[PDB]
Amino acid sequence: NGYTYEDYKNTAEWLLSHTKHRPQVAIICGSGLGGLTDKLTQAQIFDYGEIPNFPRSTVPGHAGRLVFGFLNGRACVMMQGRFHMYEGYPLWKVTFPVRVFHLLGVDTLVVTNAAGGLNPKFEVGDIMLIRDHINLPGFSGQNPLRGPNDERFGDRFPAMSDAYDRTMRQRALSTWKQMGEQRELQEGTYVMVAGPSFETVAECRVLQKLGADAVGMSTVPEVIVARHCGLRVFGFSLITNKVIMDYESLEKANHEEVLAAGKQAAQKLEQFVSILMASIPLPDK
Amino acid sequence: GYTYEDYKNTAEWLLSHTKHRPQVAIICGSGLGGLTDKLTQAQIFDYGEIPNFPRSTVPGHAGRLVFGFLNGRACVMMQGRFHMYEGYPLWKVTFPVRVFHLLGVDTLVVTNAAGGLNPKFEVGDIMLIRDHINLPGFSGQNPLRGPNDERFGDRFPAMSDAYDRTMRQRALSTWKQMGEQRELQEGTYVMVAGPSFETVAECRVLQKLGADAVGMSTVPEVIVARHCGLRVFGFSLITNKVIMDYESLEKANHEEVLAAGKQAAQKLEQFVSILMASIPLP
Amino acid sequence: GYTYEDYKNTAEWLLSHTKHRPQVAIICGSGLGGLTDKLTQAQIFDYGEIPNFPRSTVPGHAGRLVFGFLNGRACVMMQGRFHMYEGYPLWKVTFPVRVFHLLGVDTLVVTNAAGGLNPKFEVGDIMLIRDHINLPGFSGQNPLRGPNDERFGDRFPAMSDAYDRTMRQRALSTWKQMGEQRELQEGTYVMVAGPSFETVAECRVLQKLGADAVGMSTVPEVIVARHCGLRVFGFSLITNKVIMDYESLEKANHEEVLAAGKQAAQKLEQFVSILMASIPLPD
Ligand SMILES: O=c1[nH]cnc2c(Sc3ccc(Oc4c(F)c(F)c(F)c(F)c4F)cc3/C=C/P(=O)(O)O)c[nH]c12
Ligand SMILES: O=c1[nH]cnc2c(Sc3ccc(Oc4c(F)c(F)c(F)c(F)c4F)cc3/C=C/P(=O)(O)O)c[nH]c12
Ligand SMILES: O=c1[nH]cnc2c(Sc3ccc(Oc4c(F)c(F)c(F)c(F)c4F)cc3/C=C/P(=O)(O)O)c[nH]c12
Ligand code: NA
Ligand code: NA
């Protein structure tokens, strides 16, 4: 299947008529930010299943949630969880919410994730501001824009060379500076791979040689649709593990360690984003 | 997928609806739409009247098959080509090449627009396609995926000799004989699916791989053509230099591509028309 | 699109139709189908007659599971693997591996035909697979894609240790104490979808990525086996040297790869039989 413009329209107008909230900022909560909805005021919760056209979470855990409220005084719409390719979702389902956000009047997307460090400078618990991406699925046909283009969203052939807003990154660094934290923020290129299996050593070397600083399984498709629509985009990676890059290492990527990294970073990440909210540019006069 | 009878039905319909017996198929990429103007004794078919032929489901652009003589060479020209980014399966993109084979065509000329990755290239350059990197193909988006039909070709066709050496030497010589000074480029075309343009990081990847130009077409048609045994010649119009640093304000856009096309139209149409005399006879 | 109950039904059907209890699964690559003849007490099942099993769709394609003993070790052989280029989805290509797991198999041996990228390789060489590059996997053609079930494995299994170090050692040891002419090669297998062979520029890309051999199979079976916790090892027979530069009259062709996988193929088959004795017993 796909979605028509009318489908997005009906979802948007249904949400506009069922909440008083008028979000400026969309937060898609990746690994470690599950709990960020807890810091919202005047929170209003919709299960994906209540929302017309909205893909249902078919994965273990709670019904996926769209939550409207104020984060540090700023009108937010928050996706508690996101869809992954590795779960069997087509990219036109993964990115469905980004079109709806656009039609609600959102002008800014915050997108976070977990990723493996490819840059040897990176340490577990580091935060990497996404400055650029390598869409490996994109190269082969797995681009969320594949299909007919609606001129109501954007151009047939949108540019991605300016996708990661300079100002948002400037203000992430300021916020971080004023937290007087010990470690610098990192900044680099995120490469998307479909996953869900972790890289071989030979694969890690490929991604290093390609110039990737971190690797994960999400985010790029949401960024491409956001940019098609004209939203400004801010992203970062929690570095949950250092990808294994030689045959002599005794270490090995694993689910238990990357869960532990998320759980440990979780409150630091909520603190970071809660404060950053205060510094997000206002809608344009 | 199509059955073998589906291809035979379409080829039979065309052969009984036109008297034309094309030797050469020309797939007009951006910059070359107007090449049909140079045909004589033209005979026209909307894709929509041609049995089994894929159309656009966008009323924006329909498509035409045009039979005619180009500089006295019997030709069939696709005006409007199918792209993976539009949501066509590759077995639809490449459907026409199968039909051309069954019409008796023995040479495919394929042209496109491409972003320049080789820093030697300028906007408005023509690059002869010497070789390709098929990134979608590596992942399973190869037009031969599925059952193989020996009436077309082998299970496992070689692509190491896809781009006819003789036609490229004759294209270079023709470009000089025409008294053109700004030289013909030659190099490696990488297909990416698009339709969004590359990030800086992606551009750097495509350069590290050894690609000289990047586009969103052509490689599937070339693979199916070589599977069928067609001789293949092609080139890219360098419509833009791909952004390779973070400071430049240039953003790749459709308007640059359109505008580079119109500017190069007269020159490319002349080049292809005159090249027809270099194509070996059947 | 099966659930755990489907794989279980298939395994129980096999358990109740043969007394054979395999420890080792062998997937026989192109030109290596002779290995089923080295089985003792052989028992054949056509894929057609196995519940839920994907049917192979080419007129003359051997779709048979063969249970037996190879050099005195209980095993099950696939004669004819499924290939993504034939049009099979990876969940079909790898359904037998999940069934082997439920049958109690703890080891998978994978064999294939590969094009040589390493200029040191010669046609007929055997390359012990040390590592792989899953190019289809990067893009979404990963056989774990979709719902995960822990009766198979983890949502995010590691692949950096896929190729069993113990069986590496013993393959190198066994090969030496056979006094063979050429050495056993080792290196990285890159999977491409095919079915068309590589351009020179594609060749050069795969070499730049650090691949030693290229083919169109194997990696997805390895991923599903490691997901399930099976020990894995495997071999490429080098059927052809990939054309890596424009000064050359050679062309990789179906006929020259067919002929090469009738030559030192029987060498790899004897080597696989011998190495059965080096596979550890189950606890
Ligand atoms: O080396 C690597 N290679 C390739 N990819 C990767 C990834 S992506 C990933 C890997 C594991 C995972 O599990 C959890 C998890 F389930 C939690 F609940 C959690 F808190 C947590 F930190 C995790 F890491 C989530 C995600 C990424 C989801 P998303 O954030 O992109 O939506 C991490 N490291 C590597
Ligand atoms: O930097 C680059 N990166 C990756 N790819 C490219 C391409 S390929 C391309 C990009 C845009 C485009 O826009 C149209 C278009 F779609 C029309 F239909 C049209 F009439 C028209 F004028 C255009 F400008 C056409 C084509 C090329 C089609 P083709 O020649 O392969 O058939 C050019 N530059 C880059
Ligand atoms: O240069 C290369 N590039 C990319 N890929 C490759 C391959 S993989 C391959 C290529 C051709 C082929 O055909 C047969 C065949 F059909 C038989 F019946 C046969 F006996 C036989 F020896 C062949 F070579 C089989 C396979 C491999 C299947 P598998 O071993 O993985 O299952 C080999 N060389 C290259
Ligand atoms: Na000649
Ligand atoms: Na690649």
Short mmCIF file of C-alpha atoms in Angstrom, two decimals, chain A residues 7-285:
data_model
loop_
_atom_site.label_atom_id
_atom_site.label_comp_id
_atom_site.label_asym_id
_atom_site.label_seq_id
_atom_site.Cartn_x
_atom_site.Cartn_y
_atom_site.Cartn_z
CA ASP A 7 -4.94 10.27 4.71
CA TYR A 8 -2.27 12.54 6.31
CA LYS A 9 -4.77 15.46 6.22
CA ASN A 10 -7.46 13.38 8.04
CA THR A 11 -4.95 12.22 10.72
CA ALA A 12 -3.70 15.85 11.24
CA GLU A 13 -7.22 17.39 11.43
CA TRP A 14 -8.36 14.51 13.73
CA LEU A 15 -5.42 15.29 16.12
CA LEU A 16 -5.95 19.12 15.84
CA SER A 17 -9.69 18.62 16.76
CA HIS A 18 -8.88 16.20 19.69
CA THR A 19 -6.14 18.25 21.47
CA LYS A 20 -5.80 21.99 22.46
CA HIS A 21 -2.00 21.54 22.03
CA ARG A 22 -0.30 23.26 19.03
CA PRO A 23 3.25 21.83 19.00
CA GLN A 24 6.17 23.75 17.37
CA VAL A 25 8.68 20.91 18.17
CA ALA A 26 8.42 17.15 17.40
CA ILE A 27 10.62 14.86 19.55
CA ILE A 28 11.15 11.26 18.35
CA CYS A 29 12.60 9.55 21.48
CA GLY A 30 15.26 6.92 20.63
CA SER A 31 17.19 4.67 23.10
CA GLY A 32 17.46 6.25 26.61
CA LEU A 33 14.67 8.87 26.07
CA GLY A 34 11.67 6.50 26.56
CA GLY A 35 11.00 8.36 29.87
CA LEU A 36 11.18 11.97 28.57
CA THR A 37 7.29 12.16 28.29
CA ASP A 38 7.31 12.09 32.17
CA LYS A 39 8.84 15.64 32.22
CA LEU A 40 5.91 17.14 30.11
CA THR A 41 3.21 19.39 31.71
CA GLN A 42 -0.48 19.36 30.68
CA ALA A 43 0.46 16.05 28.97
CA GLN A 44 -2.22 14.60 26.63
CA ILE A 45 -1.66 11.00 25.45
CA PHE A 46 -2.90 9.27 22.26
CA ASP A 47 -2.25 5.56 21.62
CA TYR A 48 -1.24 5.03 17.91
CA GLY A 49 -4.29 2.69 17.70
CA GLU A 50 -6.72 5.55 18.61
CA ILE A 51 -5.28 7.72 15.78
CA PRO A 52 -6.72 7.30 12.26
CA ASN A 53 -4.22 5.89 9.66
CA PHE A 54 -1.43 5.73 12.31
CA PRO A 55 0.61 2.46 12.07
CA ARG A 56 0.21 0.31 15.25
CA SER A 57 3.25 -0.83 17.32
CA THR A 58 3.33 -4.67 16.68
CA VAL A 59 6.47 -5.04 18.91
CA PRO A 60 6.81 -6.06 22.60
CA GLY A 61 5.89 -3.36 25.17
CA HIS A 62 3.26 -0.61 25.62
CA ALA A 63 0.98 0.60 22.78
CA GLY A 64 3.09 3.28 20.98
CA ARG A 65 2.23 6.77 22.32
CA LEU A 66 1.96 10.26 20.85
CA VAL A 67 2.10 12.74 23.84
CA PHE A 68 1.34 16.50 23.53
CA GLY A 69 2.42 18.84 26.35
CA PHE A 70 4.91 21.53 27.45
CA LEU A 71 8.60 20.64 27.95
CA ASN A 72 10.26 23.57 29.84
CA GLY A 73 7.38 25.82 28.62
CA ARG A 74 7.74 24.78 24.90
CA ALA A 75 4.80 23.14 22.96
CA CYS A 76 6.05 19.58 22.09
CA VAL A 77 4.69 16.49 20.38
CA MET A 78 6.69 13.41 21.50
CA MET A 79 6.87 9.92 19.95
CA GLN A 80 7.84 7.68 22.94
CA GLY A 81 9.00 4.94 20.54
CA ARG A 82 9.68 4.85 16.77
CA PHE A 83 9.38 2.16 14.04
CA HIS A 84 12.54 0.39 12.75
CA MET A 85 13.15 -1.26 9.36
CA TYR A 86 14.52 -4.33 11.27
CA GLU A 87 11.01 -4.79 12.87
CA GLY A 88 9.56 -5.30 9.33
CA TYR A 89 8.02 -1.77 8.93
CA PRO A 90 8.23 -0.23 5.43
CA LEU A 91 9.86 3.26 5.41
CA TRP A 92 6.48 4.89 4.44
CA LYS A 93 5.18 3.63 7.84
CA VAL A 94 8.37 4.62 9.77
CA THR A 95 8.10 8.22 8.39
CA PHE A 96 4.25 8.53 8.47
CA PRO A 97 4.33 10.61 11.73
CA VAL A 98 6.82 13.15 10.25
CA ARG A 99 4.25 14.13 7.53
CA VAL A 100 1.54 14.48 10.23
CA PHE A 101 3.87 16.65 12.40
CA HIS A 102 4.42 18.97 9.37
CA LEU A 103 0.61 19.28 8.83
CA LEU A 104 0.04 20.09 12.62
CA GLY A 105 2.43 23.11 12.13
CA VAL A 106 5.62 21.58 13.71
CA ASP A 107 8.68 23.52 12.34
CA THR A 108 11.42 21.56 14.21
CA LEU A 109 12.23 17.84 14.57
CA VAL A 110 14.45 16.51 17.36
CA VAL A 111 15.43 12.90 16.58
CA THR A 112 17.65 10.83 18.94
CA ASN A 113 19.07 7.32 18.71
CA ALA A 114 21.60 4.82 20.08
CA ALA A 115 24.62 4.03 17.84
CA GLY A 116 27.94 2.09 17.87
CA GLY A 117 31.11 4.23 17.94
CA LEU A 118 33.23 3.82 14.79
CA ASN A 119 35.47 6.85 15.62
CA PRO A 120 38.08 5.42 18.06
CA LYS A 121 37.96 8.76 20.04
CA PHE A 122 34.34 7.94 21.11
CA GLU A 123 33.65 6.41 24.57
CA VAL A 124 30.47 4.57 25.72
CA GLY A 125 28.04 7.19 27.15
CA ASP A 126 29.28 9.86 24.71
CA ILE A 127 26.65 12.01 22.92
CA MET A 128 27.40 12.65 19.19
CA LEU A 129 25.58 15.56 17.48
CA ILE A 130 24.71 14.28 13.98
CA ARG A 131 26.41 16.68 11.51
CA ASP A 132 25.77 14.45 8.44
CA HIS A 133 24.57 10.94 7.42
CA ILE A 134 25.29 8.09 4.97
CA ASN A 135 21.99 6.51 3.88
CA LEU A 136 23.25 3.01 2.83
CA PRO A 137 19.62 1.66 2.52
CA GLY A 138 18.83 4.83 0.47
CA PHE A 139 21.50 3.97 -2.17
CA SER A 140 19.75 0.62 -2.95
CA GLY A 141 16.09 1.80 -3.08
CA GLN A 142 15.07 2.03 0.62
CA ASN A 143 14.40 5.80 0.55
CA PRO A 144 11.09 6.89 2.19
CA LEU A 145 10.37 9.28 -0.76
CA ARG A 146 10.29 6.35 -3.27
CA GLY A 147 6.95 6.54 -5.13
CA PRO A 148 4.90 9.48 -6.46
CA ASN A 149 5.81 12.90 -4.99
CA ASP A 150 3.08 15.21 -3.62
CA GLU A 151 4.11 18.85 -4.37
CA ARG A 152 2.08 19.72 -1.20
CA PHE A 153 4.89 18.16 0.93
CA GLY A 154 7.96 19.14 -1.14
CA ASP A 155 10.13 18.75 -4.28
CA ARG A 156 10.47 15.53 -6.35
CA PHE A 157 14.32 15.74 -5.77
CA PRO A 158 15.03 17.34 -2.35
CA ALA A 159 18.68 18.19 -1.38
CA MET A 160 20.05 16.60 1.87
CA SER A 161 23.47 18.40 1.97
CA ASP A 162 22.12 20.95 4.59
CA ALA A 163 19.85 18.54 6.57
CA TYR A 164 21.33 19.05 10.12
CA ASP A 165 20.58 22.66 11.24
CA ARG A 166 23.74 24.61 12.28
CA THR A 167 21.86 26.80 14.86
CA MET A 168 20.32 23.79 16.69
CA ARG A 169 23.83 22.22 16.94
CA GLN A 170 25.29 25.60 18.19
CA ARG A 171 22.67 25.65 20.98
CA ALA A 172 23.17 21.95 21.88
CA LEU A 173 26.90 22.87 22.57
CA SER A 174 25.95 26.06 24.58
CA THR A 175 23.41 24.09 26.69
CA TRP A 176 26.12 21.44 27.24
CA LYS A 177 28.80 24.14 28.06
CA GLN A 178 26.46 25.63 30.75
CA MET A 179 25.87 22.13 32.31
CA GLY A 180 29.68 22.44 32.86
CA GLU A 181 29.93 18.67 32.03
CA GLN A 182 33.35 16.87 32.13
CA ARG A 183 33.39 15.34 28.54
CA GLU A 184 32.85 17.38 25.31
CA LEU A 185 29.83 16.58 23.11
CA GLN A 186 31.06 14.61 20.03
CA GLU A 187 30.01 15.58 16.46
CA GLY A 188 30.13 13.36 13.36
CA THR A 189 28.59 11.32 10.54
CA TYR A 190 25.90 8.73 11.36
CA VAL A 191 25.65 5.79 8.89
CA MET A 192 22.30 3.97 8.82
CA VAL A 193 22.35 0.14 8.33
CA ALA A 194 19.14 -1.97 8.38
CA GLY A 195 20.40 -4.31 11.18
CA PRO A 196 19.33 -5.95 13.42
CA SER A 197 22.53 -8.10 13.67
CA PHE A 198 25.73 -6.25 14.79
CA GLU A 199 28.61 -5.72 12.28
CA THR A 200 31.43 -8.18 11.60
CA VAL A 201 34.97 -6.76 11.89
CA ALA A 202 35.20 -6.56 8.02
CA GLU A 203 31.87 -4.59 8.00
CA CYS A 204 33.16 -2.17 10.75
CA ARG A 205 36.27 -1.53 8.60
CA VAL A 206 33.99 -0.78 5.57
CA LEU A 207 31.94 1.78 7.62
CA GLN A 208 35.22 3.36 8.99
CA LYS A 209 36.69 3.62 5.40
CA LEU A 210 33.37 5.22 4.24
CA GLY A 211 34.04 8.00 6.84
CA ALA A 212 31.17 7.11 9.34
CA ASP A 213 31.79 8.10 13.06
CA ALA A 214 28.79 6.14 14.40
CA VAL A 215 26.43 3.39 13.05
CA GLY A 216 22.76 2.74 13.92
CA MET A 217 19.49 1.37 12.55
CA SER A 218 17.15 4.44 12.47
CA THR A 219 16.68 8.21 12.08
CA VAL A 220 17.94 8.86 8.49
CA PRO A 221 14.50 8.07 6.92
CA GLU A 222 12.75 10.49 9.40
CA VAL A 223 15.40 13.15 8.63
CA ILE A 224 14.83 12.77 4.82
CA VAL A 225 11.03 13.15 5.15
CA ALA A 226 11.43 16.07 7.67
CA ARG A 227 13.72 17.91 5.18
CA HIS A 228 11.39 17.08 2.19
CA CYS A 229 8.66 18.92 4.25
CA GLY A 230 11.03 21.81 5.17
CA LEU A 231 11.32 21.13 8.99
CA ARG A 232 14.64 22.06 10.64
CA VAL A 233 16.33 18.95 12.05
CA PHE A 234 18.39 18.29 15.17
CA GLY A 235 19.80 14.80 15.91
CA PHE A 236 22.18 13.04 18.29
CA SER A 237 23.45 9.54 19.05
CA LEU A 238 24.02 7.93 22.46
CA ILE A 239 27.22 5.88 21.84
CA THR A 240 26.16 2.61 23.57
CA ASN A 241 29.24 0.47 22.51
CA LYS A 242 32.52 0.72 20.50
CA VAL A 243 32.14 -1.37 17.30
CA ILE A 244 34.77 -4.21 17.20
CA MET A 245 37.41 -3.34 14.56
CA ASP A 246 40.02 -6.16 14.84
CA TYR A 247 40.25 -9.96 15.15
CA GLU A 248 42.34 -9.85 18.40
CA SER A 249 39.70 -8.04 20.57
CA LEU A 250 38.10 -10.28 23.29
CA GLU A 251 35.04 -7.89 23.33
CA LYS A 252 31.78 -8.31 21.36
CA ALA A 253 28.72 -6.00 20.83
CA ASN A 254 25.69 -7.34 22.76
CA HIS A 255 22.08 -6.46 23.65
CA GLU A 256 22.65 -6.58 27.49
CA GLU A 257 25.56 -4.02 27.41
CA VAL A 258 23.76 -1.56 25.03
CA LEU A 259 20.55 -1.76 27.25
CA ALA A 260 22.79 -1.04 30.34
CA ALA A 261 24.35 1.97 28.44
CA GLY A 262 20.87 3.33 27.62
CA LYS A 263 19.59 2.85 31.22
CA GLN A 264 22.76 4.61 32.65
CA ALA A 265 22.55 7.59 30.18
CA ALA A 266 18.75 7.87 30.45
CA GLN A 267 18.42 10.66 33.13
CA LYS A 268 21.44 12.64 31.81
CA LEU A 269 19.72 12.59 28.33
CA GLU A 270 16.33 13.75 29.75
CA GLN A 271 18.18 16.57 31.61
CA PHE A 272 20.10 17.60 28.45
CA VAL A 273 16.98 17.77 26.20
CA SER A 274 14.74 19.34 28.94
CA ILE A 275 17.23 22.28 29.18
CA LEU A 276 17.94 22.50 25.38
CA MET A 277 14.12 23.04 24.86
CA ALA A 278 14.51 26.54 26.42
CA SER A 279 17.11 27.42 23.65
CA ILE A 280 15.16 26.22 20.54
CA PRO A 281 14.45 29.11 18.08
CA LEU A 282 10.87 30.52 18.21
CA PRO A 283 8.55 30.18 15.17
CA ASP A 284 9.41 32.75 12.40
CA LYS A 285 7.79 36.28 12.61
#
